[PDB]
Amino acid sequence: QVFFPVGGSYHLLSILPSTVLNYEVSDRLYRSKIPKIRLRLLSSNAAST
Amino acid sequence: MMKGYILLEKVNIENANAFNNIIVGIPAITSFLGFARALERKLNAKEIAIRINGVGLEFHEYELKGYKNKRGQYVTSCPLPGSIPGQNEKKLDAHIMNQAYIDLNMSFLLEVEGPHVDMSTCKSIKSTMETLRIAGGIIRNYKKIRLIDTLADIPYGYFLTLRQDNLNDAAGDDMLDKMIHALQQEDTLVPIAVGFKALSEVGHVEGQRDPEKDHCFVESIFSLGGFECSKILEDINSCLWRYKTEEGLYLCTII
RNA sequence: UUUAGAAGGAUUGCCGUCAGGAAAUUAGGUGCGCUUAGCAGUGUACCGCCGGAGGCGG
DNA sequence: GTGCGGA
DNA sequence: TGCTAAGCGCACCTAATTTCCTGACGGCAATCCGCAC
DSSP states (O other): OEEEEETTEEEEEEEOOOHHHHHHHHHTTTTOOSOOOOOOOOOHHHHHO | OOEEEEEEEEEEEEEEEOBOSSOBSSOOHHHHHHHHHHHHHHHTTTTOOOOEEEEEEEEEEEEESEEEOTTSOEEEOOOOOOOOSSSSTTSSSOOOOOOOEEEEEEEEEEEEESSOOSSHHHHHHHHHSSSOOBTTBEEOOOOEEEEOOSGGGSOSOEEEEEOTHHHHSSOOSSHHHHHHHHHHHSTTEEEEEEEEEESSOOBOOSSOSSTTSEEEEEEEEEEEEEEEETTSOOOGGGGOBEEEEOSSEEEEEOO
């Protein structure tokens, strides 16, 4: 939860990540040559959680 | 009643956040603009009227926490997790989520507008910057806080600017294909995060950080950017990031 | 009022044995360096003198 | 204080 | 404490062929799961 200035006052914003966008960046970068990074931190049991 | 420019020169930031769900690298621009707003809010409680209306981001060196393999790819590193609140807080080993951290040396150009902009303002900024953070990282040291007048009093470095024209004029069939094609044509551009977009309406829900404000559920939006040197630059105004708010969109733009 | 606020990666270790790089050669022709100047600047300061440190005579 | 449930 | 002012520094042509580039054995153990019963 973060704050953002809207016109003399502030709005409180809660950020939710996108699951469908993460799946489509990874498919469209497995067959490409622009720089990329693989993150190997999540286990199988925690992914099911 | 007066307008000027203040330069925060060569600041070391250690362990700043570097993960925005599709990007691992430079932190989002909203963190830097929030650092500027936090400095503004702390200066106005010491009864010193000032207003920061624009920030320019200059880069001198960087280091990503990790290593490079023999194939030329990065492998990130994370600290060992400690006790985390929940149902398994009394255990000895905790869970490992997704994280990334970066180290930076940078310089900031601030456009200030107030009743008085002398060097006592610079002394107050020097006294108020040892109690703040940038992204989620700590400040180890700075070099000097000073006023500037023209483009020739700026130290050498590379600024960051918006390149939305190179994204709207490329390929087709979706925006992500335009992103990938525009990154394959010219090799000196990077993807950056530039703000938030709404996913609901404005109201009050249970569980907020401050229970007296308005609330909206948001999603991060991403754009393209590039680097320009400080000796090939046209004007100060063409490298200053500002806030812009439509109905449902919370952005950071270069006009 | 910053995808906010929090974090110990640790302990141990035998890379080794052997070996034929080798034979042949054409770098060659040509050519205008060159007009002027004072080692000056002052070329260096000596004996004393009382005083005791500090100050004038030739 | 247990055992489930996937890729 | 002073130590020069001007101009310029080629046109040609080429830079090899053969044979091959090892056989073995192996590459850690520990931990990193919320939730409804």
